Amino acid sequence: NPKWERTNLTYRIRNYTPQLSEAEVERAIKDAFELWSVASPLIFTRISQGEADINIAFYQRDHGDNSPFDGPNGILAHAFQPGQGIGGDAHFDAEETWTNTSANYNLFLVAAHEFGHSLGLAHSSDPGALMYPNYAFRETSNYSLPQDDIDGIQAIYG
Ligand SMILES: [Ca+2]
Ligand SMILES: [Ca+2]
Ligand SMILES: [Zn+2]
Ligand SMILES: [Zn+2]
Numbered sequence: 251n252p253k254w255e256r257t258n259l260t261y262r263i264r265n266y267t268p269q270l271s272e273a274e275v276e277r278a279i280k281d282a283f284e285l286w287s288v289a290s291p292l293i294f295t296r297i298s299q300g301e302a303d304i305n306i307a308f309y310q311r312d313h314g315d316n317s318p319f320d321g322p323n324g325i326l327a328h329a330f331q332p333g334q335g336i337g338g339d340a341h342f343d344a345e346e347t348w349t350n351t352s353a354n355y356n357l358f359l360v361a362a363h364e365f366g367h368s369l370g371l372a373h374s375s376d377p378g379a380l381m382y383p384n385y386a387f388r389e390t391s392n393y394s395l396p397q398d399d400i401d402g403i404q405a406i407y408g
Pocket of ligand 2: 302303304305333334335336337338339
């Protein structure tokens with residue numbers, strides 16, 4: 251159950267996807283980070299360049315970590331548990347159709363899921379939990395973290 255020992259973590263988006271605009275990738279990521287923040291003592295800070303705790307990046311197939319992606323659909327993305335270097339980072343499959351809508355796949359919802367993994371959360375068995383193993387769309391505007399998930403970060407940190 252490793253968790254971060256620091257509450258203010260930094261993050262960095264190393265690249266984007268031609269699908270959405272640049273300000274649509276950041277907003278998606280920005281908000282995905284807020285969800286966990288309003289349910290924990292964690293504060294996330296963004297940085298343009300430099301070393302950051304959670305590295306965000308879009309990759310295809312082999313991207314140097316023994317966990318290749320698989321092209322359209324299937325494995326939408328993945329993240330690492332709290333730790334150094336790679337620990338905490340999140341990588342998204344670049345061969346996916348990233349949208350802002352209800353269309354597969356909503357970047358916000360997926361990011362919100364991986365970030366749960368970076369902070370130390372595991373999968374849930376509640377079909378309504380954000381941390382549920384499989385994807386599912388849910389209204390994103392005015393979207394808030396599911397109680398099971400709230401019990402999640404709350405159980406690790408505070
Ligand atoms: Ca895939
Ligand atoms: Ca890291
Ligand atoms: Zn990876
Ligand atoms: Zn997962």
